[PDB]
Design an enzyme around this catalytic site. Structure first.
Site, PDB file in Angstrom:
ATOM      1  N   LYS B  62       0.812  -1.212   0.000  1.00 47.77           N
ATOM      2  CA  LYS B  62       0.000   0.000   0.000  1.00 47.77           C
ATOM      3  C   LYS B  62       0.851   1.270   0.000  1.00 47.77           C
ATOM      4  CE  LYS B  62      -3.697  -2.628   0.447  1.00 47.77           C
ATOM      5  NZ  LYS B  62      -3.081  -3.983   0.393  1.00 47.77           N
ATOM      6  N   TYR B  63       2.171   1.125   0.111  1.00 50.13           N
ATOM      7  CA  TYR B  63       3.060   2.282   0.175  1.00 50.13           C
ATOM      8  C   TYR B  63       4.189   2.184  -0.848  1.00 50.13           C
ATOM      9  CZ  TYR B  63       0.603   2.738   4.603  1.00 50.13           C
ATOM     10  OH  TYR B  63      -0.369   2.836   5.572  1.00 50.13           O
ATOM     11  N   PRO B  64       4.760   3.339  -1.246  1.00 48.09           N
ATOM     12  CA  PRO B  64       5.903   3.305  -2.156  1.00 48.09           C
ATOM     13  C   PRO B  64       7.100   2.578  -1.536  1.00 48.09           C
ATOM     14  CG  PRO B  64       4.969   5.514  -2.055  1.00 48.09           C
ATOM     15  CD  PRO B  64       4.332   4.719  -0.955  1.00 48.09           C
TER      16      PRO B  64
END
Ligand SMILES: [Fe+2]
Ligand SMILES: [Fe+2]
Lengths: 285, 281
Positions: B62-64
């Protein structure tokens, strides 16, 4: 005086959900066929016959010696585990009811028998197991639903549940009179569905030397709330004989509260529990 | 501009409670000794060095990728499991903080490593994992505490946690200005304690910065991380307190729950499992 609405088992689910919002409760007629009810009753007979355990009984030790109670019927009653627990109408209702909160699971399902000579309960709300529910405002997404299975007839004499329609909107329980409530008179095969916050009372049993009134209560809660009963010690083979839905209900899979939770809950190694376990199910490849 | 108050690790817990009530947060200086911080970092290094996984990663995806993450550190880091998780000061704080709510346990504890060149998080409350918390009024017994362990230096440059003092009393978060917050600048071994409803933001890293975030929640709330797949020999090597934190025992929400939670056959989970512990057979 408005009565609890009785709906056919195949009635419109949106109608059911609107009754929960307005009245706070309704009855499904003839949801479970006679053979299923009879099968479940034989399984419950067996558990009622097992004599009191020797040592600690966490809930039972807190009530008088007459308390008739069998916990976590999912682990001991195949008909509940394999049929009743996964009833499609119940889950259609749950899906609609819990739309705003996200996934739900089984917090508890247990047996009570209420014998002749028991007084009615005082009016109350079911907000004790997870006390945080007491502070949830009316407008918040609901986090708990009660599904009540009469296993004997529920009559005026033997303690049909007393429900005050619309009382989920009240600020507090207060001190309502008995004639403000209406009765959930029902037969085996029917189900009573009760919304969070609804003021109600168990009816006791005013019959004289009659048979006990039998009921199984199932609490379906948001997956945000810890199950009262943990089904984690069930044999793997027993769990793998259930459907995916059944496994999800009993806490054996990763679940999803609504956004803004965008990940899930009940996971490990940043993976789904069922994948970590390599969990098989009756209806999955 | 009032700053986060720094207390000695042996400060009185009632002073710590007053700060959570007034400011919503405080810092403990030098709670974890150097040797504990070092061994914990060495254990985390081992997990960071193991090749990445072949499949979905529920939180990490869900995150870079400049967001580095080791999940459920109790399962791989003995120093966390055996020392940090059961720290007596942390539990003294928790016991006081949760006195209206009842028992608490570990919802999650994981490593976040923020690579250089990342901007700060948006201001938020930690009410996303259990969204029902969003609707809990200020007056209600608290159900969550955020405990933030810096494992590298937290500086003004590298993204020290940004905390808006007194913001637990706000009705809503909205969109605050950065200048409303103060910085939790810290050395490794310090701890930042943040009350429920306090508005804050991760500082990113504008120079990696290493932090372990631990969330202690009321036992009424389902743990984000489930420790049920821990090997029995690992579970039994922990203390009773450790086992209670990781969901392996029956627990007790406040009265009117007069029975408990996380039980089966009307018995305690640990009795059904016949579970030994390091400090109790
Ligand atoms: Fe009740
Ligand atoms: Fe946060």
């Amino acid at each position: 005086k408005p009565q609890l609405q009785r709906l056919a088992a195949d009635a419109d689910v949106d109608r059911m959900c609107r009754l929960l919002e307005e009245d706070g409760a309704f009855i499904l007629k003839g949801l479970l066929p006679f053979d299923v009810v009879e099968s479940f009753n034989r399984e419950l007979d067996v558990q009622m016959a097992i004599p009191p355990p020797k040592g600690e009984r966490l809930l039972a030790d807190k009530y008088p010696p007459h308390f008739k109670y069998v916990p976590n019927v999912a682990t001991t009653c195949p008909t509940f585990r394999n049929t009743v627990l996964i009833n499609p109408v119940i889950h259609a209702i749950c899906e609609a009811y819990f739309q705003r909160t996200g996934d739900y699971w089984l917090s508890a399902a247990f047996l009570r028998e209420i014998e002749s000579g028991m007084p009615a309960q005082p009016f109350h709300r079911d907000d004790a197991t997870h006390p945080l529910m007491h502070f949830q405002p009316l407008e918040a997404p609901p986090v708990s639903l009660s599904v009540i299975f009469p296993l004997t007839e529920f009559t005026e004499e033997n303690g049909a549940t007393e429900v005050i329609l619309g009382s989920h909107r009240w600020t507090e329980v207060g001190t309502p009179e008995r004639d403000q409530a209406v009765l959930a008179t029902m037969d085996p095969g029917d189900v009573l569905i009760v919304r969070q916050r609804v003021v109600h009372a168990g009816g006791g049993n005013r019959t004289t030397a009659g048979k006990p009134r039998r009921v199984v209560l199932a609490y379906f809660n948001s997956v945000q709330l810890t199950p009262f009963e943990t089904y984690r010690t069930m044999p793997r083979e027993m769990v793998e004989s259930m459907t995916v839905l059944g496994q999800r209900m009993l806490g054996w899979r990763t679940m999803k509260p609504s956004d803004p939770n965008i990940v899930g809950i009940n996971l490990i190694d940043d993976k789904r529990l069922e994948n970590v376990l390599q969990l098989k199910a009756a209806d999955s490849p």
